[PDB]
Amino acid sequence: SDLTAFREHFAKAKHIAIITGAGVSAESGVPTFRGPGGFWRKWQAQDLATPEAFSRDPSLVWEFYHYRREVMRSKMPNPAHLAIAECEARLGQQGRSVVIITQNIDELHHRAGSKHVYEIHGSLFKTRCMSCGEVKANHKSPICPALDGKGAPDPNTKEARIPVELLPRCERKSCNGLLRPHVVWFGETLDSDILTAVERELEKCDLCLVVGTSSIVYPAAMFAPQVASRGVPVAEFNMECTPATQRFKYHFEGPCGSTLPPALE
Amino acid sequence: XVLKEYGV
Ligand SMILES: [Zn+2]
C-alpha cells in the first residue's frame, strides 16, 4: 500500500476530505458505550440514546449525557486530531482546503484547532429546544444545577429522578422548553442540509482520508463510492486487518495517533 | 432522510 505513494498524492492534493470515526475519539480515551463491556450503569448507548428513552425518562438520559459532558474535561485530543488541524492550517495558507466530516460528538476536532468541520451526528456541547427548536452551544459545567454531581456510572447509583422543570430549559423566557442534546439518536435521520454540504465537499475533493473507521461501513459508505467513482484516492487509517491476498490500495493499519502524523507532515 | 446507521 506504500507511504511514499500516498505522500506523492498528498503533495499534489488541493482539496482534501477527512472522514473520522469512533476510533479517533477512542484513542483519546472517550468511551463509546457500545458493544463489549461499555456499560453506563445497567445500560448501553443503544438503550438510552433514543427518542423513546428521552420521552420516557428524560432525567436518566440527561444523567447519561451529563456524565459524558464531564468526562470530556479530562480527555484531550490525541496526535491524530492535532496533525489534522495543523495540516488544515498549513495547507490553508497555501490555498488548499482540508475539511473534516466526523461521526464523533465530543468536539475533539474543534479543540485541536480544526475549523472546517461537519459534525454529522451533532455534538454533546450543543442543546436543542424541544419547543422552539433553537440550537445553541453549551459548555457549562454542570449544564444545570439539578444535575450537579449526578450521572455516576456505577450500576448501583440511585437515579437522580430530577423533575422535568429542573432539567435544562430554554433561556428565552417566553419559551422555557425542555432542552435535549443536539445529537442524532438511533431512529432519527441526519440533517439534509449537512449532507448536501458534505456531498458538495466530497465532489470537490481530490484526496479522501478515512480515519478511525472503514469505507465499507457507515458513515463512510454513504460517500466513498462517489469519490472513488471519480478516480480519487482513498486512504484508510484504522486498526483493522487486511487479508493476506487482497491488499487494500492505501490502508495504514495501526492506531491513528501513530500512523497519521507522519503521513500528514 | 438517512436513518442513522441505516437502522442497523
Ligand atoms: Zn425554546
Numbering used by the authors:
A (entry chain A): 34 to 298
B (entry chain C): 1 to 8
Show the paper's wording.
Among the protein Lys deacetylases, sirtuins form the evolutionary defined class III. Sirtuins are increasingly recognized as deacylases with isoform-specific acyl selectivities, catalyzing removal of acylations emerging as posttranslational protein modifications, such as succinylation or crotonylation. The sirtuin core comprises a Rossmann-fold subdomain and a smaller Zn2+-binding module.
The Sirt4 motif is shifted one helix turn, however, with Sirt4-Tyr104 oriented back to the region occupied by Sirt5-Tyr98, but Sirt4-Arg107 pointing away from the acyl channel. Due to a slightly different conformation, however, Gly111 is shifted and the area of Sirt5-Arg101 is occupied by the Sirt4-loop residue Asp201, which would result in close contacts between the carboxylates of Asp201 and an HMG substrate.
